[PDB]
Enzyme design. Sequence first.
Site, PDB file in Angstrom:
ATOM      1  N   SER A  93       2.911   2.834  -5.341  1.00 51.51           N
ATOM      2  CA  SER A  93       1.888   1.967  -4.764  1.00 51.51           C
ATOM      3  C   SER A  93       0.625   1.726  -5.591  1.00 51.51           C
ATOM      4  CB  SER A  93       1.492   2.457  -3.363  1.00 51.51           C
ATOM      5  OG  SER A  93       2.495   2.111  -2.412  1.00 51.51           O
ATOM      6  N   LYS A 141      -0.340  -1.833  -6.743  1.00 53.47           N
ATOM      7  CA  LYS A 141      -0.952  -2.796  -5.832  1.00 53.47           C
ATOM      8  C   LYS A 141      -2.370  -3.166  -6.212  1.00 53.47           C
ATOM      9  CE  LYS A 141       2.242  -1.355  -2.279  1.00 53.47           C
ATOM     10  NZ  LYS A 141       2.496  -0.421  -1.167  1.00 53.47           N
ATOM     11  N   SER A 171      -1.464   0.557   1.823  1.00 58.15           N
ATOM     12  CA  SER A 171      -0.214   0.540   1.067  1.00 58.15           C
ATOM     13  C   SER A 171       0.875  -0.212   1.814  1.00 58.15           C
ATOM     14  CB  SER A 171       0.297   1.957   0.784  1.00 58.15           C
ATOM     15  OG  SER A 171      -0.339   2.519  -0.338  1.00 58.15           O
ATOM     16  N   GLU A 179       9.065  -4.055  -3.442  1.00 55.70           N
ATOM     17  CA  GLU A 179       9.043  -2.948  -2.496  1.00 55.70           C
ATOM     18  C   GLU A 179      10.324  -3.102  -1.657  1.00 55.70           C
ATOM     19  OE1 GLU A 179       7.190  -0.476  -2.269  1.00 55.70           O
ATOM     20  OE2 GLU A 179       5.211  -0.919  -3.111  1.00 55.70           O
ATOM     21  N   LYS A 196      -6.583   4.408  -5.316  1.00 55.11           N
ATOM     22  CA  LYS A 196      -5.317   3.911  -4.812  1.00 55.11           C
ATOM     23  C   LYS A 196      -4.247   4.924  -5.192  1.00 55.11           C
ATOM     24  CE  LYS A 196      -2.671   1.285  -2.550  1.00 55.11           C
ATOM     25  NZ  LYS A 196      -2.002   2.542  -2.146  1.00 55.11           N
ATOM     26  N   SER A 197      -3.550   5.467  -4.195  1.00 50.82           N
ATOM     27  CA  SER A 197      -2.498   6.452  -4.444  1.00 50.82           C
ATOM     28  C   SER A 197      -1.092   5.900  -4.253  1.00 50.82           C
ATOM     29  CB  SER A 197      -2.663   7.639  -3.501  1.00 50.82           C
ATOM     30  OG  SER A 197      -2.600   7.199  -2.148  1.00 50.82           O
ATOM     31  N   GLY A 198      -0.114   6.705  -4.637  1.00 45.41           N
ATOM     32  CA  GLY A 198       1.261   6.304  -4.476  1.00 45.41           C
ATOM     33  C   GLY A 198       2.176   7.510  -4.343  1.00 45.41           C
ATOM     34  N   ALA A 199       3.350   7.272  -3.776  1.00 38.36           N
ATOM     35  CA  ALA A 199       4.367   8.305  -3.608  1.00 38.36           C
ATOM     36  C   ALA A 199       5.707   7.584  -3.650  1.00 38.36           C
ATOM     37  CB  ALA A 199       4.195   9.027  -2.274  1.00 38.36           C
TER      38      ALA A 199
END
Length: 263
Positions: free
Chosen positions: A45, A48, A105, A141, A209-212
């Site tokens: 993510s 983005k 997200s 996505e 901004k994080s993501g997994a």
Amino acid sequence: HPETLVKVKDAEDQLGARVGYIELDLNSGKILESFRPEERFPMMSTFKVLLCGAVLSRVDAGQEQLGRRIHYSQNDLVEYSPVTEKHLTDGMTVRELCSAAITMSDNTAANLLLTTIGGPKELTAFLHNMGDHVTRLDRWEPELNEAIPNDERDTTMPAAMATTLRKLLTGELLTLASRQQLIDWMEADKVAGPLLRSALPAGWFIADKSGAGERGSSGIIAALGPDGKPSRIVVIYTTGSQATMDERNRQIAEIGASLIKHW
């Protein structure tokens, strides 16, 4: 500071996986510290922020309008679309879609925006054109989070992402209005609490901004600093771990704690 590299190595030992790290001076673009700066990691993510910078770029050129409404349907909904699934009937504006993609997200929101700019291929072109010759988006996505070992699809390098976030937030690429809009969205981030924000002293500023993704992949990009002003950019990625999301987050937060301690 090397004490922070110590925590990153600890992170790798704890997670049994690679951890990429960059600490960058926001003002001058200097690289203060790094670990695996030029290895590839799945963006998840975090892409983005890049997506919405491209959307904003189109707005600056008058090729797009933040207020333009976009309609979609059930056929467009993918897993984890917390905001888009609520406005199916109303549709959503480009502005509302970026807010959703960045602060929540929202996956469908990203796919919708991806379409308006020409998809993964045009995001990659936009990045290359602004000087990022390694960061690439190839899928949509949710497949872009697959993180197949050694797959270069949908990856970035900590060093590349760090400078790209810098250009987008403080460079001349976007207008002052857009740069501010992009950082406001990142500041309003609602799902990264367990990461760097958990180790942030009170009164500090942070836009992130994080993501997994699959295969124990987690990450975060951010502009933070004391006295309500950002002064450095921090990028952290990890992939390949068998660790739970909570464990990966604790590790990223500890790295954050070390960076703050040795600021």
